């Protein structure tokens, strides 16, 4: 009937977290990136981001209808109060979740870690990304497991800006031999408007407005025909 506001917000966060985990374990092969809920009067619209949408809807939305049915019958919303959409993401080649899933599904079928891993690092770099770091840890065969990491560009670690400039995705890829952990960190580039980069710049970068060339005569003398 009614629960305290702290409990209400904690439960809403739990709703978001478990929904995110549920459709992460559902459609990671669909290039899922993230899920966002929208506050609407007495309704809860949910919009879901995936690299591919024709697959997530499929034919006549069998997958979409299955997902909405299971979410409705799991979460206890009133009949037909939960509806999930599917819209593409403008930032696909530098989103940590998308590239982590790409690495996992290039590494699952059996492939040299380095070729696919450098390929995804490239596809990150030509997507305008400012810097990337990928680490693959686990069995490189033998009695010892190792970690190999490839970095490119500039990427920061410490301070506040790592919160809103670097996104990191940690995933497990299950090989018939073992489990390989992939950690993919990307720093977005600064670009105001469009929501493609963080609004604020790096807080140690001082920008200066550039004057233009000025080669002028001694005195401005009016000229008429």
């Amino acid at each position: 009937v009614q629960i305290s506001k702290k409990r209400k917000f904690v439960a809403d966060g739990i709703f978001k977290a478990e929904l995110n985990e549920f459709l992460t374990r559902e459609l990671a092969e669909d290039g899922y990136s993230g899920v966002e809920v929208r506050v609407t009067p007495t309704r809860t619209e949910i919009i879901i981001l995936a690299t591919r949408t024709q697959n997530v809807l499929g034919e006549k939305g069998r997958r979409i209808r299955e997902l909405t049915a299971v979410v409705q019958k799991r979460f206890g919303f009133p009949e037909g109060s939960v509806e999930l959409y599917a819209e593409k993401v403008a930032t696909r080649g530098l989103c940590a979740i998308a590239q982590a899933e790409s690495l996992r599904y290039k590494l699952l079928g059996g492939l040299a870690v380095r070729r696919a891993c450098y390929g995804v690092l490239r596809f990150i770099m030509e997507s305008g990304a400012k810097g990337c770091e990928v680490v693959v840890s686990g069995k490189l065969r033998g009695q010892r497991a190792k970690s190999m990491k490839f970095v490119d560009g500039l990427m920061i670690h410490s301070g506040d800006p790592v919160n809103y400039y670097v996104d990191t995705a940690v995933r497990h890829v299950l090989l018939r031999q073992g489990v390989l952990g992939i950690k993919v960190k990307i720093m977005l580039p600064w670009d105001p408007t469009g929501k493609i980069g963080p609004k604020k710049p790096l807080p140690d970068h001082v920008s200066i407005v550039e004057p233009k060339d000025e080669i002028l005569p001694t005195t401005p003398i009016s000229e008429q025909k």
Binding site: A112, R114, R115, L140, R141, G142, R144, K146
Partner: peptide
Amino acid sequence: FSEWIDDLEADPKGKFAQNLLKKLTG
């Protein structure tokens, strides 16, 4: 070629060291 590079750089001095280096270009 990539698989040989990975095997070599995993254990550059272990049991699978001479064979991988030979297999690289020979």
